[PDB]
Amino acid sequence: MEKEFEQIDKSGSWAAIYQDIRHEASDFPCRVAKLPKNKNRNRYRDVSPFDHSRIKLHQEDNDYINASLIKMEEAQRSYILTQGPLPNTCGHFWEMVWEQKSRGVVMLNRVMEKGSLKCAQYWPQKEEKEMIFEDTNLKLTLISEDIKSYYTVRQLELENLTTQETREILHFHYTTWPDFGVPESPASFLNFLFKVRESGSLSPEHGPVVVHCSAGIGRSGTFCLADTCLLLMDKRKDPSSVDIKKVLLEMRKFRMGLIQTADQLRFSYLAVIEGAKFIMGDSSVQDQWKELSHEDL
Ligand SMILES: O=C1C[C@@H](c2ccc(C[C@H](NS(=O)(=O)c3cccc(F)c3)C3=N[C@H](CCc4ccccc4)CN3)cc2)S(=O)(=O)N1
Ligand SMILES: [Mg+2]
């Protein structure tokens, strides 16, 4: 895998490789997303979920949410990629989390980035100030939070007011991943990812983990591509067989525009190439990533 990487770097062909992916990517209808009544449920007019893979709310009224089920068959892992909730779809967001039985939520952006709102504050910042999303009859409470230098893990209690059932939802929030940018290093990215893995939130016993950034395609796509590829390397007889460009195209059949810049594509290679070391056995690389990520700053 690192040979193709090396030749692409030498060829200076990341932009061409990336644009070939954009040109060969699937194109499916998003008619429900474009209905007039769903306009205020979409954050960006040009980022919509395909009809065949969109997540449907269980409500009779309007089952629309800008969210997509990315189902990776060979890797055996599903992910729900959605945009950062809007002030009016925070209820919907948690209704989806509930209905799909998700156990973890991976946030890769901040609410405000370089002076622009990118996502509503959809979870409570203070223990004593819980949230109620009336339209859905769900209560959400911040139970605790473990704040690190570039990421925070939070324990939330989501409750179905109707049946009074409660569930613990884990929130994995990467706070230093610039929009249209890349993580500081493969190490800090992988250190984060393996934290989500180790939590059990990605277990096939739970519903799909919900991943989102602002549009739910660039950073969210980088995160899922890397995870899927590492899963594939550990599954196959010959890990060098994983074609990342092919995997990204498979994912793009489920949601448009996954991976938004050639450099995020390149970062994906680096993250996977670096992550292969743990998958092949190396039992010390994880401590190395942790040190390199300086999480305890
Ligand atoms: O690294 C990233 C990029 C962010 C991102 C991606 C896309 C958008 C949508 C935005 N729409 S717009 O109405 O402000 C806007 C801005 C400029 C031109 C235009 F016609 C509309 C955006 N679209 C193009 C990208 C288009 C696109 C490509 C492929 C699939 C879907 C959309 C670039 N930024 C916002 C943020 S992420 O939160 O997904 N992670
Ligand atoms: Mg306090």
Side-chain angles (χ1 to χ4, degrees):
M1 180 184 266
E2 46 186 88
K3 277 186 179 185
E4 161 173 45
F5 178 77
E6 170 174 276
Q7 190 55 54
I8 297 177
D9 251 10
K10 186 171 166 189
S11 287
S13 63
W14 283 104
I17 291 284
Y18 180 61
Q19 292 297 140
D20 286 332
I21 290 165
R22 300 193 65 246
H23 192 264
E24 316 168 22
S26 311
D27 186 24
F28 292 115
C30 303
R31 299 182 199 117
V32 172
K34 291 319 211 155
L35 292 175
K37 75 171 181 289
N38 289 153
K39 179 183 183 195
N40 67 7
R41 293 191 173 205
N42 293 315
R43 177 168 289 282
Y44 303 107
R45 73 172 176 276
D46 62 340
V47 181
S48 303
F50 297 140
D51 293 322
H52 83 80
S53 60
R54 75 189 184 85
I55 293 296
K56 298 187 189 169
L57 301 179
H58 291 175
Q59 48 168 289
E60 308 294 2
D61 187 52
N62 191 327
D63 70 7
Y64 181 74
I65 180 157
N66 187 313
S68 314
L69 175 63
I70 276 56
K71 185 166 182 180
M72 306 303 283
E73 201 185 311
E74 184 187 0
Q76 296 181 188
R77 175 157 291 166
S78 284
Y79 315 81
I80 289 175
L81 273 62
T82 189
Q83 54 177 34
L86 292 151
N88 63 305
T89 65
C90 285
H92 306 154
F93 180 89
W94 291 108
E95 186 188 327
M96 170 173 72
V97 170
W98 187 272
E99 296 167 0
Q100 307 304 131
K101 295 183 162 57
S102 308
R103 148 72 168 180
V105 174
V106 173
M107 180 168 179
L108 306 161
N109 64 299
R110 279 178 295 134
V111 165
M112 186 178 284
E113 306 181 324
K114 298 183 187 178
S116 304
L117 284 183
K118 300 289 189 68
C119 174
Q121 186 53 60
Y122 66 84
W123 73 93
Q125 288 159 298
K126 297 176 292 180
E127 282 85 338
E128 70 266 34
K129 214 182 180 74
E130 73 283 1
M131 294 174 80
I132 285 275
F133 302 94
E134 297 187 13
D135 65 324
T136 38
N137 220 192
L138 288 165
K139 181 166 59 186
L140 179 68
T141 306
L142 169 60
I143 299 303
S144 72
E145 69 188 331
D146 179 29
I147 300 177
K148 290 289 177 189
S149 68
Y150 70 102
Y151 76 91
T152 296
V153 178
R154 311 190 177 76
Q155 179 186 169
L156 311 167
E157 176 170 291
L158 177 62
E159 189 189 324
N160 174 322
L161 289 173
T162 300
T163 59
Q164 285 182 70
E165 168 180 4
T166 67
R167 295 178 187 171
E168 168 178 276
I169 299 292
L170 298 180
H171 196 229
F172 298 99
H173 190 186
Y174 202 107
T175 71
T176 62
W177 192 334
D179 206 5
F180 290 97
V182 298
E184 175 164 353
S185 69
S188 74
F189 166 77
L190 290 170
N191 180 58
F192 179 72
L193 169 70
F194 280 74
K195 176 64 227 92
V196 179
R197 284 187 168 193
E198 299 185 331
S199 75
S201 305
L202 310 187
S203 165
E205 72 181 293
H206 304 300
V209 57
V210 172
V211 191
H212 80 85
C213 42
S214 191
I217 58 178
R219 292 170 277 186
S220 292
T222 303
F223 178 83
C224 296
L225 176 51
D227 184 58
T228 290
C229 288
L230 290 163
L231 224 51
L232 287 169
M233 294 183 83
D234 183 53
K235 227 175 178 59
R236 302 178 177 183
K237 291 287 309 305
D238 175 47
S240 65
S241 63
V242 184
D243 191 335
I244 166 171
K245 301 184 305 313
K246 290 189 170 195
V247 178
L248 180 49
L249 285 164
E250 176 63 32
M251 271 166 54
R252 284 200 176 209
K253 292 174 183 180
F254 297 102
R255 187 168 172 82
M256 64 175 68
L258 309 190
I259 305 272
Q260 282 284 288
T261 70
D263 202 47
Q264 295 186 325
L265 177 57
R266 187 180 184 264
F267 181 79
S268 286
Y269 272 72
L270 295 168
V272 178
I273 285 170
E274 171 69 44
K277 298 192 282 181
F278 160 98
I279 306 303
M280 300 303 276
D282 195 310
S283 50
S284 69
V285 294
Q286 197 157 45
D287 292 322
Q288 170 197 69
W289 301 328
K290 198 169 154 293
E291 280 301 329
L292 274 169
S293 76
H294 205 191
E295 79 179 5
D296 304 310
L297 173 59

